[PDB]
């Protein structure tokens, strides 16, 4: 049933977690602040197109993985961002984003020609391995394993997703396992919607994470929110 799916999901995470901190590879022109500045632009686009909640974080997943092995330049950052957006959408949406819709969002600084080529470029560099496991993919499962009814899951799930989006924007969570980001931001949500020890141990028992980690993680997310 669901237990078989969790085990597999957990297994995969390691494969779709950026290999290293790349700000020593793109040291010429890349900077952590630019990576976040780009993140908020990706968030605007997705919230604007009402994309599936999963696209953004997924797109950021592609970004980090690409920046890990490929030293790109400052001016090509926006171009790279759109491609990741595109791909993420193409993989996880019924009606994905067209290269023209993204073209107008780049204020026409990125021609449709560039978008087609770079889509192939990013795919090759990521070896077409895009079916990545991201934090969001843990929501449904860890929500079912709770003491809450679907009767109230609507608000909890929505609130949890802003924490999920938060993480994707903040580089400090980039290297974090999707499961921890999920179980952590979903704890920050449930606790803000109505103790803590009994809650954190319930969540940890699900994803097999440690109670210590979960707490420090959950607290860091809540801290990152207020200081964003």
């Amino acid at each position: 049933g669901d237990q078989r799916v969790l085990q597999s999901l957990l297994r995969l995470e390691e494969r779709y977690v950026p290999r290293a901190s790349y700000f020593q590879c793109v040291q010429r022109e890349i900077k952590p602040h630019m990576r976040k500045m780009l993140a908020y632009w990706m968030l605007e686009v997705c919230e604007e197109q009402r994309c599936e909640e999963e696209v953004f974080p997924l797109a950021m997943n592609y970004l980090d993985r690409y920046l890990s092995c490929v030293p790109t330049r400052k001016a090509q950052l926006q171009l790279l961002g759109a491609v990741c957006m595109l791909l993420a959408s193409k993989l996880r949406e019924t009606t994905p984003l067209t290269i023209e819709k993204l073209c107008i969002y780049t204020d026409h600084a990125v021609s449709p020609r560039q978008l087609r080529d770079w889509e192939v470029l990013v795919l090759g560099k990521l070896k077409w391995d895009l079916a990545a496991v991201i934090a969001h993919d843990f929501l449904a499962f860890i929500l079912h394993r709770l003491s809450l009814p679907r009767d109230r899951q609507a608000l909890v799930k929505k609130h949890a997703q802003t924490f999920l989006a938060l993480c994707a924007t903040d580089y400090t969570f980039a290297m974090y396992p999707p499961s921890m980001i999920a179980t952590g931001s979903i704890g920050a949500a449930v606790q803000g919607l109505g103790s803590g020890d009994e809650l954190t141990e319930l969540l940890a028992g699900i994803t097999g994470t440690e109670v210590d980690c979960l707490r420090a993680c959950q607290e860091q997310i809540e801290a990152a929110l207020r200081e964003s």
């Binding site: 995969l12 791909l87 193409k90 023209e100 020609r113 087609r116 391995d129 895009l130 079916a131």
Partner: peptide, 18 residues
């Protein structure tokens, strides 16, 4: 509608890699 890759192709290729 702009340069694109057949969604069905990028999906199934990514499904295999997985």
């Amino acid at each position: 509608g702009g340069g694109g890759l057949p969604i069905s192709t990028v999906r199934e290729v990514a499904l295999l890699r997985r």
